[PDB]
A = this chain, B = another copy of it.
Amino acid sequence: INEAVRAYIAQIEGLRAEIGRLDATIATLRQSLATLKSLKTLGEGKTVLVPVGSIAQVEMKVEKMDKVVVSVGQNISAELEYEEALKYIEDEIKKLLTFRLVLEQAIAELYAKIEDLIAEA
Residues of A bordering B, CB below 8 Å: 1-2, 5-6, 9, 12-13, 16, 28-29, 31-39, 41-42, 46-64, 68-79, 82, 85-86, 88-89, 91-92, 111, 114-115, 118-119, 121
Residues of chain B contacted by A76 (CB below 8 angstroms): 35, 38, 48-51, 55, 57
Please give the distance in Å from A35's CB to the nearest CB on chain B. Answer: 3
A60 adjacent to B63 (CB under 8 Å): yes
Closest 5 pairs between A and B when the two form their complex, measured CB to CB = A35-B73, A60-B60, A38-B73, A55-B71, A49-B77
A73 adjacent to B36 (CB under 8 Å): yes
A64 adjacent to B55 (CB under 8 Å): no
- When C-beta atoms are compared, the residue in chain B nearest to A42 turns out to be B72
